[PDB]
């Protein structure tokens, strides 16, 4: 269900993120541990042994010492822990102690969903966010050419029938964005769209 590790890696590299990309990880992604280059990762909420559950993106901007955590659903940390049994405080601590002279960092995260509740497109939305991040690392969540294509909806409305048109339109815009930007996606488009469909789940 949803995108494989290799699909995500191929697409993120089509999107120009290869130099920065630490790889597709399970929930044990260790963090941002050395040097001063822009960095990013795609991280599952679950361990590899489970077969995977949900995809998140992380970005690290060394200039500002800002870590971005992008959940396509925009869940809070408390809700990621409750729903997905996923916590990432240890990774942030590790990263701050490795990279920041004052043992601090800034954490920016979404409060809104771009994705329908039954969609299997989370990893693809993560790739789209990472394109925004590597091209506009000081303002990836909104107010850039990539994320301006999507409409965020309050996370608390995720299960409402009133938002389904908006969330489906986001998915259609995601696929058109990927078709413009990714030869991998173009070559496998029908299959990937089936596998990641809005009502898949």
């Amino acid at each position: 269900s949803g995108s494989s590790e290799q699909e995500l890696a191929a697409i993120v590299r089509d999107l120009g993120c290869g130099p920065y990309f630490l790889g597709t990880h399970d929930k044990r992604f260790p963090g941002f541990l050395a040097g001063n280059k822009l960095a990013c990762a795609i991280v599952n909420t679950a361990g590899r042994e489970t077969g995977g559950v949900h995809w998140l993106a992380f970005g690290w901007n060394p200039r500002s010492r800002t870590c971005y955590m992008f959940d396509p659903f925009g869940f809070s940390d408390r809700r990621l822990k409750q729903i997905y049994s996923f916590e990432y405080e240890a990774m942030l601590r590790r990263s701050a102690l490795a990279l920041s002279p004052d043992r601090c960092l800034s954490l920016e995260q979404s409060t809104q969903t771009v994705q329908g509740p039954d969609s299997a497109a989370c990893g693809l939305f993560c790739c789209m966010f990472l394109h925004a991040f590597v091209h506009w690392p000081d303002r990836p969540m909104d107010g850039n050419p990539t994320m301006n294509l999507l409409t965020g909806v309050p996370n608390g409305m995720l299960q409402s029938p009133q938002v389904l048109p908006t969330l489906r339109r986001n998915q259609e815009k995601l696929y058109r964005f990927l078709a413009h930007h990714s030869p991998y996606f173009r070559s496998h488009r029908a299959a990937i769209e089936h596998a990641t469909a809005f009502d898949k789940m």
Binding site: L97, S106, L107, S110, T111, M141, D142
Partner: peptide, 10 residues
């Protein structure tokens, strides 16, 4: 998306 940015110190 709307977002929140918080400072975390360790």
């Amino acid at each position: 998306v709307k977002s929140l940015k918080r400072r975390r110190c360790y």
